Amino acid sequence: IQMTQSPASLSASVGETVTITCRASGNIHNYLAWFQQKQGKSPQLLVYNAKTLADGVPSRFSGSGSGTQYSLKINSLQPEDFGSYYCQHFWSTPYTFGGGTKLEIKRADAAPTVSIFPPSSEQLTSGGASVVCFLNNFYPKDINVKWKIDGSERQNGVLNSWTDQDSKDSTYSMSSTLTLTKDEYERHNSYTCEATHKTSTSPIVKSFNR
Amino acid sequence: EVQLVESGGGLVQPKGSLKLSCAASGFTFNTYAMNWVRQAPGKGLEWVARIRTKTNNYVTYYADSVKDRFTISRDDSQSMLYLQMNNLKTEDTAMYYCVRHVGDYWGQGTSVTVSSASIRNPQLYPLKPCKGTASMTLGCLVKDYFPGPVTVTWYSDSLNMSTVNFPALGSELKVTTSQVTSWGKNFTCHVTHPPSFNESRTIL
């Protein structure tokens, strides 16, 4: 008895009701459980025995379904319900988990705030240099960050990471690091961070060695 | 009130052994059926093992992935749950959570990495804006750190503060940054790598 879950990614604004379904290989007889796991945190139980809510779980997390197909309806979506949701059965061993559903809190688009940070001297002595640019409080998540060194695009080596949506603002935040050798850092004197989304003009922040 | 502490997890070379301990507190131990659940670095969750009560004579169910390799066990006297992992494959690299029954209460989890490489303690660098371009923000950098996870927490003098921890981007040698927003004179980021790297650097 293995479980298949739909959809894989949902996006609704605050107040709109969503319905995640979870299918099964056979009859599990209302032995299913729903969990909410926020990024980098332990899962928390939401609904057990198909429809029975759990303690501390708000009443908007209505569970439903029966037979070999079950669902999970969240009316009045609160901004603190982002994350992935899993469905697990407990009828027969092994107790298979579900695929998951990334729930994105849709929000009004917002332009990013760009701050660029120059490499530290300790790193420069270590034989390398990394320039970090922090983009905070921006929506949507999709953003194009192009690092320019003396007016030349250098997307060859960059490590970009996106934070989870803020619990209240429902805003994303991102960090982009440009890792280069110390010889390259001394050669070029101009370094710039360019981020392109919403308005076509790119909020840019530059620096110079001096 | 119900707490679950997991310990004993870290880097273990392939074809080796590691033992995991789930120290429980806040509820009657011998009455519940204890499960273990793991989660891949970025993928979904997965059920591994379960141990029934003493009334059921400690019935154990294993998933077909670790059928002959893993060994669950419990000691209701000391109220601790154990999972002994033998012949560890590289695919078993995951974070392990001990859970009670259908998942009423979960643990903080402990990360297990099955790798042939060696622990490279992190190289933390301070990140501050250039003088003359003072701004209401700062941050730290944690480069060349293996394996996860890095415990980066912030301590600052100003009461109000805003700290955002970024995801670790890496598969062989990871790197993570963390920003702080000046809200409300100095600050420090305390990094902690699991093989005892209690180090910190201050920015002022």
Residue numbers in the entry:
A (entry chain L): 2 to 211
B (entry chain H): 1 to 184, 188 to 207
Paper text:
Here, we report the first crystal structures of the complex between a murine Fab/IgE (heavy and light chains naturally paired) that recognizes the allergen profilin from natural rubber latex (Hev b 8). This profilin is involved in the latex-fruit-pollen syndrome and oral-allergy syndrome and is highly cross-reactive. Profilins are involved in multiple cellular functions, such as motility, through regulation of the polymerization of actin microfilaments, binding proteins with proline-rich domains, and binding phosphatidylinositol, among others. The murine Fab/IgE 2F5 is a non-recombinant IgE obtained in response to immunization with rHev b 8 allergen.
We could not model all the residues of one of the three molecules in the asymmetric unit, but the electron density was enough to model all CDRs and the backbone. We compared the structure of the three free Fabs in the asymmetric unit with the Fabs structure in the rHev b 8 Fab/IgE 2F5 complex at 3.04 Å. No changes were observed, showing no flexibility, or induced fit in the antibody paratope when the allergen epitope was recognized. The free Fab/IgE 2F5 elbow region is comparable to the complex’s structure at 3.04 Å (RMSD varies from 0.73 Å for heavy chains to 1.1 Å for light chains). The crystal structure of Fab/IgE 2F5 showed N-linked main glycosylation at the N189/F190/T191 sequon of the Fab’s heavy chain constant region.
